[PDB]
Write a protein that binds this ligand. Structure first.
Ligand code: SF4
Ligand SMILES: [Mg+2]
Ligand SMILES: [Mg+2]
Ligand SMILES: [Mg+2]
Ligand SMILES: [Mg+2]
Ligand SMILES: [Mg+2]
Ligand SMILES: [Mg+2]
Ligand SMILES: [Mg+2]
Ligand SMILES: [Mg+2]
Ligand SMILES: [Mg+2]
Ligand SMILES: [Mg+2]
Ligand SMILES: [Mg+2]
Ligand SMILES: [Mg+2]
Ligand SMILES: [Mg+2]
Ligand SMILES: [Mg+2]
Ligand SMILES: [Mg+2]
Ligand SMILES: [Mg+2]
Ligand SMILES: [Mg+2]
Ligand SMILES: [Mg+2]
Ligand SMILES: [Mg+2]
Ligand SMILES: [Mg+2]
Ligand SMILES: [Mg+2]
Ligand SMILES: [Mg+2]
Ligand SMILES: [Mg+2]
Ligand SMILES: [Mg+2]
Ligand SMILES: [Mg+2]
Ligand SMILES: [Mg+2]
Ligand SMILES: [Mg+2]
Ligand SMILES: [Mg+2]
Ligand SMILES: [Mg+2]
Ligand SMILES: [Mg+2]
Ligand SMILES: [Mg+2]
Ligand SMILES: [Mg+2]
Ligand SMILES: [Mg+2]
Ligand SMILES: [Mg+2]
Ligand SMILES: [Mg+2]
Ligand SMILES: [Mg+2]
Ligand SMILES: [Mg+2]
Ligand SMILES: [Mg+2]
Ligand SMILES: [Mg+2]
Ligand SMILES: [Mg+2]
Ligand SMILES: [Mg+2]
Ligand SMILES: [Mg+2]
Ligand SMILES: [Mg+2]
Ligand SMILES: [Mg+2]
Ligand SMILES: [Mg+2]
Ligand SMILES: [Mg+2]
Ligand SMILES: [Mg+2]
Ligand SMILES: [Mg+2]
Ligand SMILES: [Mg+2]
Ligand SMILES: [Mg+2]
Ligand SMILES: [Mg+2]
Ligand SMILES: [Mg+2]
Ligand SMILES: [Mg+2]
Ligand SMILES: [Mg+2]
Ligand SMILES: [Mg+2]
Ligand SMILES: [Mg+2]
Ligand SMILES: [Mg+2]
Ligand SMILES: [Mg+2]
Ligand SMILES: [Mg+2]
Ligand SMILES: [Mg+2]
Ligand SMILES: [Mg+2]
Ligand SMILES: [Mg+2]
Ligand SMILES: [Mg+2]
Ligand SMILES: [Mg+2]
Ligand SMILES: [Mg+2]
Ligand SMILES: [Mg+2]
Ligand SMILES: [Mg+2]
Ligand SMILES: [Mg+2]
Ligand SMILES: [Mg+2]
Ligand SMILES: [Mg+2]
Ligand SMILES: [Mg+2]
Ligand SMILES: [Mg+2]
Ligand SMILES: [Mg+2]
Ligand SMILES: [Mg+2]
Ligand SMILES: [Mg+2]
Ligand SMILES: [Mg+2]
Ligand SMILES: [Mg+2]
Ligand SMILES: [Mg+2]
Ligand SMILES: [Mg+2]
Ligand SMILES: [Mg+2]
Ligand SMILES: [Mg+2]
Ligand SMILES: [Mg+2]
Ligand SMILES: [Mg+2]
Ligand SMILES: [Mg+2]
Ligand SMILES: [Mg+2]
Ligand SMILES: [Mg+2]
Ligand SMILES: [Mg+2]
Ligand SMILES: [Mg+2]
Ligand SMILES: [Mg+2]
Ligand SMILES: [Mg+2]
Ligand SMILES: [Mg+2]
Ligand SMILES: [Mg+2]
Ligand SMILES: [Mg+2]
Ligand SMILES: [Mg+2]
Ligand SMILES: [Mg+2]
Ligand SMILES: [Mg+2]
Ligand SMILES: [Mg+2]
Ligand SMILES: [Mg+2]
Ligand SMILES: [Mg+2]
Ligand SMILES: [Mg+2]
Ligand SMILES: [Mg+2]
Ligand SMILES: [Mg+2]
Ligand SMILES: [Mg+2]
Ligand SMILES: [Mg+2]
Ligand SMILES: [Mg+2]
Ligand SMILES: [Mg+2]
Ligand SMILES: [Mg+2]
Ligand SMILES: [Mg+2]
Ligand SMILES: [Mg+2]
Ligand SMILES: [Mg+2]
Ligand SMILES: [Mg+2]
Ligand SMILES: [Mg+2]
Ligand SMILES: [Mg+2]
Ligand SMILES: [Mg+2]
Ligand SMILES: [Mg+2]
Ligand SMILES: [Mg+2]
Ligand SMILES: [Mg+2]
Ligand SMILES: [Mg+2]
Lengths: 208, 122, 96, 82, 99, 137
RNA sequence: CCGAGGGUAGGGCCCGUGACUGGGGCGAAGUCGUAACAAGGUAGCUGUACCGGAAGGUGCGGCUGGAU
RNA sequence: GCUAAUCCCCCAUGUGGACCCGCCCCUUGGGGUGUGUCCAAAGGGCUUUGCCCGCUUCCGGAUGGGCCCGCGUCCCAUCAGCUAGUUGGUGGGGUAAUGGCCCACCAAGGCGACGACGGGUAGCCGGUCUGAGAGGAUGGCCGGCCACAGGGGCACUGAGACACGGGCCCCACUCCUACGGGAGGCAGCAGUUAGGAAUCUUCCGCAAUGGGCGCAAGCCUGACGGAGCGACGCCGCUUGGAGGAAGAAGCCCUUCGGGGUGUAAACUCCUGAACCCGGGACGAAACCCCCGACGAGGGGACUGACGGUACCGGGGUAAUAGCGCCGGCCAACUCCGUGCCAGCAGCCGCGGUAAUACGGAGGGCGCGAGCGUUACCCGGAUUCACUGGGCGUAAAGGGCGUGUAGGCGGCCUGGGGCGUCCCAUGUGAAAGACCACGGCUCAACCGUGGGGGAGCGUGGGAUACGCUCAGGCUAGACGG
């Protein structure tokens, strides 16, 4: 399945802060705050010029590792976006963001997507009433993404939902806290989200 | 050529010559070792490369490479072969697959074990 | 190791007999009239030729002759006889 | 003879028929003469049955023969209503 | 409809049969240039009224013989010995093309 | 002389390239029509039916751009590019739907249609195809 | 009568194989000389012919893709 | 040797059809009519002077076909000439029907550089894979057509077969036998063996769908619907989530100060794959029965292989990770061992005592129930170049004329309208493909709707260009 391993080393390699844990990501116990250099024996040696290929690989891995998604599903989504009408970059990011485990995280149901996945998977989430335990479900405009009322009395979701009381949620989303439910308003612009990612470089990678 | 010349003679699509004739359409071919020896490579290399002469089910008799450090192959050794030449060994167009039939895997191999037919160590 | 295919085979040999029987009889009387007509002998030709036509259409009741084969056979018979009697004449009866 | 019946389409444990006019001697899912409606025995959708009633009556008139459970479905579309 | 073809009578050495050469043009499927191809049809001439060099129309017809599937329909032009000669000159050139 | 049309296009190409005022091509009705289009689209100043030593010709008046600065002061051509498409060796015909767009519209395709010699724009308006004579830009 | 095929005889094509034999490719750690690349120590190359352990030579005619 | 019938036969009846000849219409043998001649039949069952199932002749419909035709359909010209039923005719035979399909005679024809004949390879298509497109490759699975049923020939029965599980014969092979004689045909479903690198259960059910027979009940159905095995392929899912030290041990590197694996572990909380118990389908309403009329219509029941499965509810355990690679192409570097050895290698190249290239280790990169390898197809390959290449010296101008076929062709006018262009129209099956919506929790998969196209048939139109026919011209060419 998913990467399921050490996650700080990912940000370290990627040279940027990816927020893959939630809480510690903002603490001084964050690794990017302590050691902002690539993992392993050679982290502190001086980098030589990355090749063009090198550059585009990394930009793609960044985007990937953000969502904890397989290269397979990633590539499929990309391939969908390329043949899909309009502009590939936006559509790709849009489709990425429409993943259930992702929406569950963007709505603050969880601190990380990893946790969001386990939430979705363990059926603690529903879509328009119906239970959906598939992280890959494509949420469409007008969908109600709620906590399972049979799971609403869960510590973790509470502490997380407590943290969301008036906390802003992207323009494309709306959260009704206390009711433990949210809605998907429309598919997000590249503009409407500020990923540390030039998604053109991803296009260029898959055109090789 | 003129357009008329093309109408008359056309363009010629040239077929590719297989580098693995003894395989006769197949990914692999089983065979039996007749000669198992060492062979010295050409310039600028120097070695005693391990090689078996194999008699295939495809009716061919060819020389195949025995990759890896050490082997247990001898006369009458049953053996599976695959394509792939050894550039420095003229006439050697195939590789014996380690870990098939009478070909042992490489002893104490640790890296790249699937290519050398070695099971995962405890 | 057995079937009603056996039954079907038995039946075919009995239907076989009857088809040949009728077909032979038709062939006999056909050429017969034609022979008479040749040396015609008009009344005798037509008399036999009337009998051939009957056996023909009668064959086409069942599986022996297809209607078109019957039609074809009658046509050639009558065509042959008339053309033969035309060397001498005269047609003493019908038809036609 | 020429018949009006159900050619199975769809997939495993997801039966979806096209009610169809074809020669009886055809294979069940073979080339058919004309499609005159569909049928979804599981009612997974609002309209799980459609029948061009106009065309169906023609085939009936010209000598076609419905299967039993086709005639059932053909009844539900009121082809036999006088 | 029955196919109707125009061509020259290049042989009448047969009883009640003439040989009609027919030509057609078309663009080469790949190289685009327009090219000529011809074909000889055996034509039914029940009156034996068709002479060498006649431009005629033949129409697709029920089989008359093995290879005869066309009747001559009508005369179009006459005395085209100039065409007949191009057919014959080529056949004549073939002895030069052996070994 | 196997292709009068290609000879004319070539007579022009050779002349413009060394910046002649005009050039003479042997005259024909079909050539006039092509020049008619060439002028009305501004590739040439125009033409006139003249006579050379007793023979009907077409004098084609060439047009260029302004003198340029720098090492090479020769002016940009107005006709950068002109070449035959359909040729005696291979006739090229398109239907109205196959009519090309020369240089994204910055250029023209000349075609002979059963409504006469037209540009690709014109042919598309009238909705007819024809033989693709040449392309200019 | 025709007729699967069988039999007799004689041809044609293709494949595998054969004492032995011809040259070829690769190998290279050998023997002989050094033909070509410099005017390569006889300018070279060339078709042909004759000749020599070998590279090659010479004749006849040709080319310059020959140094001075 | 007996005996029935929807078995066979004869006679009648002739609505009508069949055939000969004449006539009209037509125009290949299409329809109509006149004399003659010829041909019909079967009964069964109920609730019984009425029904239902059948039977008979004839027209038609619909469906499914046969035959024929134009065009398209691979490699070798180191295959260049092929042909006696051969090509045509007349007459017969044969068929449902045209035809040398078959026969008899008459004539001497038929085909070929636009590739006959011969050799090799191949079932063809819808499609499929690739590709910017053009094109290339391929035709298994599904659909359509063809061909075959151990090898070969043959006809019989029949609406239809020259018939996979029908007949006859010959051959090869195998088996049974009581040794006299007999039997067989998995390229149906499973299964065995052999061959191979390699390819499945001697499973369940007719519940659905479909087929045969039956008035109906119903019977049959290895079609089919399903279950089994195989990471074979694609799709979905798990092996946990949060917190957690300037950071344990172990291992690796170290200039000995330290760096690394690494929030990684431990540890804490939280969730709860698996499993446990409880419920439990959709796929199935028709045939039928009853009222109506055996119809229209209305009510009535019977029935699930998969399956106690999916799925719903209750509980509930932190719960498999591996494979390739890290010289350049190409993303990932260090220590040791080795010392042109052992070995690596797709190409270039690595290895001779400080090897980022061999072997291990630490570390890193890339994918993840997969990862790599071999094989093959298209791509990159404008490296067969139509789109889209070349030939002084790189591979490439024929030693040179002459000329056959063919390809190509000057200026003006008109006819025709062949190419070519335009419009209308028929055809372009379904599946697949593309856009949209929808159904299985998503996806894969599947359903529903939408838009085309070339190509060819037909009808009408256009005439510049190319073609053709006709008439002029002199600028090319030839002649004086
Ligand atoms: S902590 Fe810093 S490093 Fe570790 S995941 Fe959150 S952001 Fe990346
Ligand atoms: Mg963030
Ligand atoms: Mg850059
Ligand atoms: Mg796009
Ligand atoms: Mg924002
Ligand atoms: Mg961010
Ligand atoms: Mg690409
Ligand atoms: Mg063997
Ligand atoms: Mg070396
Ligand atoms: Mg052994
Ligand atoms: Mg290889
Ligand atoms: Mg490895
Ligand atoms: Mg029976
Ligand atoms: Mg007798
Ligand atoms: Mg009959
Ligand atoms: Mg004839
Ligand atoms: Mg072109
Ligand atoms: Mg014989
Ligand atoms: Mg014989
Ligand atoms: Mg015999
Ligand atoms: Mg030898
Ligand atoms: Mg010398
Ligand atoms: Mg020397
Ligand atoms: Mg010298
Ligand atoms: Mg010499
Ligand atoms: Mg000698
Ligand atoms: Mg000597
Ligand atoms: Mg000498
Ligand atoms: Mg000399
Ligand atoms: Mg000379
Ligand atoms: Mg009796
Ligand atoms: Mg009677
Ligand atoms: Mg009965
Ligand atoms: Mg005849
Ligand atoms: Mg028949
Ligand atoms: Mg014949
Ligand atoms: Mg004869
Ligand atoms: Mg004779
Ligand atoms: Mg031809
Ligand atoms: Mg050829
Ligand atoms: Mg063969
Ligand atoms: Mg084959
Ligand atoms: Mg390309
Ligand atoms: Mg094929
Ligand atoms: Mg296949
Ligand atoms: Mg198939
Ligand atoms: Mg056979
Ligand atoms: Mg057989
Ligand atoms: Mg067999
Ligand atoms: Mg047999
Ligand atoms: Mg019969
Ligand atoms: Mg058959
Ligand atoms: Mg069988
Ligand atoms: Mg059978
Ligand atoms: Mg049989
Ligand atoms: Mg037995
Ligand atoms: Mg027995
Ligand atoms: Mg006995
Ligand atoms: Mg016997
Ligand atoms: Mg058996
Ligand atoms: Mg089998
Ligand atoms: Mg086996
Ligand atoms: Mg075996
Ligand atoms: Mg099996
Ligand atoms: Mg199966
Ligand atoms: Mg059933
Ligand atoms: Mg049934
Ligand atoms: Mg029935
Ligand atoms: Mg009853
Ligand atoms: Mg049975
Ligand atoms: Mg069964
Ligand atoms: Mg099945
Ligand atoms: Mg699986
Ligand atoms: Mg520290
Ligand atoms: Mg640390
Ligand atoms: Mg430590
Ligand atoms: Mg430390
Ligand atoms: Mg953790
Ligand atoms: Mg719970
Ligand atoms: Mg049910
Ligand atoms: Mg009812
Ligand atoms: Mg039932
Ligand atoms: Mg239960
Ligand atoms: Mg539960
Ligand atoms: Mg608990
Ligand atoms: Mg744990
Ligand atoms: Mg790799
Ligand atoms: Mg190095
Ligand atoms: Mg790579
Ligand atoms: Mg690198
Ligand atoms: Mg050693
Ligand atoms: Mg390796
Ligand atoms: Mg060293
Ligand atoms: Mg060392
Ligand atoms: Mg390497
Ligand atoms: Mg190494
Ligand atoms: Mg997967
Ligand atoms: Mg390739
Ligand atoms: Mg190409
Ligand atoms: Mg070209
Ligand atoms: Mg080139
Ligand atoms: Mg040239
Ligand atoms: Mg050269
Ligand atoms: Mg020359
Ligand atoms: Mg000449
Ligand atoms: Mg000429
Ligand atoms: Mg010409
Ligand atoms: Mg012209
Ligand atoms: Mg004209
Ligand atoms: Mg005109
Ligand atoms: Mg025209
Ligand atoms: Mg169309
Ligand atoms: Mg379609
Ligand atoms: Mg849906
Ligand atoms: Mg399209
Ligand atoms: Mg038309
Ligand atoms: Mg003229
Ligand atoms: Mg002159
Ligand atoms: Mg002169």
């Amino acid at each position: 399945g998913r990467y399921i391993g050490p996650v700080c080393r990912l940000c370290r390699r990627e040279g940027v802060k990816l927020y893959l844990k939630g809480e510690r990501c903002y603490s001084p116990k964050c690794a990017m705050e302590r050691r902002p250099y690539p993992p392993g024996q050679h982290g502190q040696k001086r980098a030589r010029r990355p090749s063009d290929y090198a550059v585009r690989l990394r930009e793609k891995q960044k985007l990937r590792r953000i969502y904890g998604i397989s290269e397979r599903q990633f590539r499929n989504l990309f391939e969908e976006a390329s043949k899909k009408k309009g502009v590939t970059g936006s559509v790709f990011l849009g489709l990425l963001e429409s993943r259930l485990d992702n929406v569950v995280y963007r709505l603050g149901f969880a601190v990380s997507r990893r946790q969001a996945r386990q939430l979705v998977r363990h059926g603690h989430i529903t879509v328009n009433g119906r239970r959906v335990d598939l992280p890959s479900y494509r949420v469409r405009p007008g969908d109600e993404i709620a906590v399972a009322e049979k799971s609403r009395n869960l510590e973790l979701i509470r502490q997380n939902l407590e943290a969301m009381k008036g906390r802003k949620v992207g323009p494309w989303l709306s959260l009704d806290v206390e009711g433990m439910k949210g809605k998907f308003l429309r598919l997000p612009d590249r503009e409407d989200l500020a990923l540390p990612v030039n998604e053109q470089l991803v296009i260029e990678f898959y055109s090789r | 050529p003129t357009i008329n010349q093309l109408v008359r003679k056309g363009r010629e699509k040239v077929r590719k010559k297989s580098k693995v004739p003894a395989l006769k359409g197949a990914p692999f071919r089983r065979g039996v070792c007749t000669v198992v020896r060492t062979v010295t490579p050409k310039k600028p290399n120097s070695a005693l490369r391990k090689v078996a002469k194999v008699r295939l089910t495809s009716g061919y008799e060819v020389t195949a490479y025995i990759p890896g450090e050490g082997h247990n192959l001898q006369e009458h050794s049953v053996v599976l072969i695959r394509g792939g030449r050894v550039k420095d060994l003229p006439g050697v167009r195939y590789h014996i697959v380690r870990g098939v039939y009478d070909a042992a895997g490489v002893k104490d191999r640790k890296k790249s074990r699937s290519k050398y037919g070695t099971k995962k160590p405890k | 190791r057995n079937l009603s295919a056996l039954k079907r085979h038995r039946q075919s040999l009995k239907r076989r007999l009857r088809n040949k029987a009728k077909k032979s009889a038709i062939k006999t009387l056909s050429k017969k009239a034609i022979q008479l007509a040749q040396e015609g002998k008009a009344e005798e030709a037509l008399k036999i030729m009337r009998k051939a036509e009957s056996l023909i259409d009668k064959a086409a009741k069942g599986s022996t002759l297809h209607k078109n084969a019957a039609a074809r056979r009658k046509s050639r018979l009558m065509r042959k006889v008339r053309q033969l009697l035309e060397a001498a004449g005269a047609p003493l009866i019908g038809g036609g | 003879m020429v018949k009006i019946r159900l050619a199975r389409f769809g997939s495993k444990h997801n039966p979806h028929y096209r009610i169809v006019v074809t020669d009886a001697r055809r294979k069940r899912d073979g080339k058919y003469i004309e499609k005159i409606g569909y049928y979804d025995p599981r009612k997974t959708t609002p309209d799980w049955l459609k029948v061009d009633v106009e065309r169906a009556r023609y085939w009936l008139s010209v000598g076609a023969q419905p299967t039993d459970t086709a005639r059932r479905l053909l009844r539900q579309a009121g082809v036999f209503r006088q | 409809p029955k196919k109707v073809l125009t061509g020259v009578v290049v042989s009448d050495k047969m009883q009640k049969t003439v040989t009609v050469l027919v030509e057609r043009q078309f663009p080469h499927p790949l190289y685009g240039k327009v090219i000529k191809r011809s074909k000889k049809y055996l034509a039914h001439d029940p009156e034996e009224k068709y002479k060498l060099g006649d431009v005629v129309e033949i129409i697709e017809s029920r089989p008359i013989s093995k290879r005869k599937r066309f009747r001559v329909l009508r005369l179009v032009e006459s005395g085209r010995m100039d065409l007949v000669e191009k057919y014959l000159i080529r056949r004549q050139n073939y002895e030069s093309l052996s070994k | 002389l196997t292709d009068p049309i290609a000879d004319m296009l070539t007579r022009i190409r050779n002349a413009t390239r060394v910046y002649k005022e005009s050039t003479d091509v042997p005259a024909s009705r079909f050539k006039e029509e092509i020049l008619r289009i060439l002028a009305r689209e501004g590739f040439i100043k125009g033409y006139e039916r003249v006579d050379v030593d007793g023979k009907p010709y077409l004098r084609v008046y060439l047009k260029y751009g302004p003198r340029r600065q720098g090492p090479d002061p020769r002016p940009e051509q107005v006709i950068h590019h002109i070449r035959r498409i359909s040729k005696p060796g291979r006739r090229v015909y398109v239907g109205v739907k196959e009519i090309p767009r020369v240089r994204r519209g910055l250029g023209i395709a000349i075609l002979s249609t059963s409504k006469g010699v037209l540009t690709d724009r014109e042919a598309r308006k009238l909705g007819v195809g024809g033989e693709l004579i040449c392309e200019v830009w």
